[PDB]
Every structure is written in C-alpha cells, then in structure tokens.
Design a protein around this ligand. Structure first.
Ligand SMILES: Cc1ncc(COP(=O)(O)O)c(C=O)c1O
Length: 405
C-alpha cells in the first residue's frame, strides 16, 4: 500500500524539466507549490507566542478540546448524539491511525472476543491502504462490494446493495464519507438511504472514512450529511477523520476516531479499551497538529476563515476539472470527458488504461497511478496544456487491444 509515496519519490528524482506529479492527493497552488493555509500560519504564530504551553504528555486518548471539536465537525453542533453524551473521540495519527485503532478494536472486542473472521467489506476499487490496514489488524476475510461501473462511469448501486444484502450479519463496511478515493463518485443522499436501509436490516457495522470533509461540495456541513443521516437512523458506528487535507497538515499527523454509541456507558467502555490499544502502539498522540485544529475550530472567527480556505481549494479544483475537460475536447480526444467534471473531491478517475499511464509516466514525466487516477489539485494553468496534449497522445496512440482494431 505504498505506491503513491514511491510515485512521489520517483518524481522528485526525475531530472526532466517537463515533470508533473499527479499521484498523491496533496493540494498545490496555481503555481504548483504547497499551500500552508492562512488560518494555519496565524494559529501557529499564536502557539509560538503562547508561553503557557508545555510539552507534558497528553492523555492517551489525546487533547480533549481537539477531540470534541473534531467530532462536532463530523456530527454537527446540534447533534442529538452530542446532547445525549453518547459520542467519543480518540485522537489518532492522521486518518490512517484512526482506521488502524478502530480496526484493532473491532478485531478484539466486536462480534465476540478476538474474532478475526468477521468479514470486512471495502469498495471496488478503494484506497490502497484499506485492505492493508485491516489485514494488519488480523482480519482474515476482506471482501469487495461493487461500486464502480467502468462502462457508465458511475455507481453500480444495484451491485452495491446486492453485495450488502448477501453479507453475513455483523460484517464491517468501510464507507467513504464523501469524496470517494479513487473514483470521485459518491452516493446521492437518496442512494445513501437505500444503503443504510440494507445495513440496518442486516446489522452491518458502518466504519466511515472521512479524509476529505470539505472537498466534495466545498461545504463542510453538506459533506457530512451521510454521517449525520446514520446518526439519525440509530446506528452505532466509527468515523475515522483526517485533517491532513482540509487543514493541509499532512506532516503533523492529525486525525480523530469518532465513536457513536447507543448510550454514554457504551462509549466509556469502548474508550477504556481504546486506551490499551493506543498505549501499545504509540502510547499517546502528538500535540502540535491537534492544538492548531482545536484552536481553529473552537473560535468562531478562525473557524469562518478556515472554511473560506477550504472553499478556496475546492473552487480551484472545480476550475481545473473544467479546464482539463475543455482542453481534451478542443483537441478532439476520442471518447467522452464529462466524467472529469462530474466527479468530485481531489481526484479524477480518468479511465486511461495501464499502458496509457506507462506512456505518460515514462515518456512524458507525468506521474499518476496505473489505475488512471489523477490528483486534480496537481493541475495548474501552466501545466494544463502539457497534460491535455499528453493525454491526447496516449489516447490516440495506445489502443485498448493491440490486435483486431
Ligand atoms: C480514503 C483515505 N482514507 C485515509 C487517508 C489517510 O490520511 P492520513 O494522511 O491523514 O493518514 C487518506 C489520505 O488522505 C485517504 O485518501
């Protein structure tokens, strides 16, 4: 599960001046540089001048203000679950750490004691590290639900539902909260209702993965609709949150595992068990990233500025999608390209085949995944024409099948 990071390493070492990194989902400005969000520079300065801050261990489960703030962002300020004190939060090492802690919990305490046979269902296709994290937790039966229909380039809703109907009771279902990685296609709210209905009837466990809240619609509230719907339907569930993308805090490793239970006693028990799992993994979590997020989200002014920074990223992505589609169309590139602008989040699942990716990587020094996934936030007004013309070359020169064409 380390392909994107190897892609980045190959890109850095490449001497060719034309090179473009469209692999890893990391935001870039229109001049192709990292963007430290304005709200983050401001809160960092406030931390650097605040002499009451010490370096003593945080609690095992982490910084209380951060955990509350994060769960609130997922669930909404007026969530009934918050009001009924049936919500817990475990500060984690980014989204990955939240998924891993959640996985280790389920493998020890869920559906019996030390049950490694509980099926875990992930999307077809999904993030590379999903299978790897759940296998590391010791789960033996990892399965796929139909998701991507490559013919219609949207959701195979009937397949998805049918796979969930046939899942053994109590199976764990890893659901992308919004901004599906890699397809950029999410269920509509009406589709989510049908999914939830099947999960409720078959007692399936929702394990949400929320790594991109803000990037699907530009609006934090709207991107959490599905999480909030599952709360309202009476589910207990996990939701692994990352702030790597929406705060641009990749290298400070800031995540939160939100837990929604039936009652406060449920949460107290789950959390006391999570303490043991954290202790034998990283002991307790790092402070800097969590303090930046806690400060931002607990202050109405910084919060508003932050949501404006997220909107800025989401809007730049929209523009890059429109521009790429337009240039491919003006070049008369074969096939249709509306899927570039239909898809949402950070990525486009372009539909290019593995030989077309190989051409782009080795001949044109444009780095993307063998699947055809690109990071749309890697495109810029300066690289767009090179990327479009290169895709055109690949699509016209490299056939799907060498013979019979
Ligand atoms: C779907 C998905 N889940 C989890 C993660 C893990 O993020 P992190 O770097 O915060 O550990 C990513 C990457 O942002 C992701 O795309």
């Amino acid at each position: 599960p380390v392909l994107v990071f190897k892609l980045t390493a190959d890109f850095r070492e490449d001497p060719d001046p034309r090179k473009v990194n469209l692999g890893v989902g990391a935001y870039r400005t229109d001049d192709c540089h990292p963007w430290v969000l304005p709200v983050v520079k401001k809160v960092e300065q406030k931390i650097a001048n605040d002499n009451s801050l010490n370096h003593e261990y945080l609690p095992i489960l982490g910084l209380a203000e951060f955990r509350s703030c994060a769960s609130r962002l997922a669930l909404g300020d007026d969530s009934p679950a918050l009001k009924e004190k049936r919500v817990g939060g475990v500060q984690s090492l980014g989204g990955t750490g939240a998924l891993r802690i959640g996985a280790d919990f389920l493998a020890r305490w869920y559906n019996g004691t030390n049950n490694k046979n509980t099926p875990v269902y992930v999307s077809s296709p999904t993030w590379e590290n999903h299978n790897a994290v759940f296998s590391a937790a010791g789960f033996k039966d990892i399965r796929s639900y139909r998701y991507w229909d490559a013919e219609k380039r949207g959701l195979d809703l009937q397949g998805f539902l049918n796979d969930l109907e046939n899942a053994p009771e109590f199976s764990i279902v890893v659901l992308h909260a919004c901004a599906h990685n890699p397809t950029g296609i999410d269920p509509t709210p009406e589709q989510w209702k049908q999914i939830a209905s099947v999960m409720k009837h078959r007692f399936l466990f929702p394990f949400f993965d929320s790594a991109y809240q803000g990037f699907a619609s530009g609006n934090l509230e709207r991107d959490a609709w599905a999480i909030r719907y599952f709360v309202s339907e009476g589910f207990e569930f996990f939701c692994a949150q990352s702030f790597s993308k929406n705060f641009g805090l990749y290298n400070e490793r800031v995540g939160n595992l939100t837990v929604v239970g039936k009652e406060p006693e449920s949460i107290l028990q789950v959390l006391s068990q999570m303490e043991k799992i954290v202790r034998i993994t990283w002991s307790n979590p790092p402070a800097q990233g969590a303090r930046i997020v806690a400060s931002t989200l607990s202050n109405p002014e910084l919060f508003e500025e932050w949501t404006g920074n997220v909107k800025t990223m989401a809007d730049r992505i929209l523009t890059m999608r429109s521009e790429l589609r337009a240039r491919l169309e003006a070049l008369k590139t074969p096939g249709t390209w509306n899927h570039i602008t239909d898809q949402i989040g950070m990525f486009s699942f372009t539909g290019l085949n593995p030989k077309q990716v190989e051409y782009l990587v080795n001949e044109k020094h444009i780095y993307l995944l063998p699947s055809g996934r690109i990071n749309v936030s890697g495109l810029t007004t300066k690289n767009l024409d090179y990327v479009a013309t290169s895709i055109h070359e690949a699509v016209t020169k490299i056939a799907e099948n060498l013979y019979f064409q």
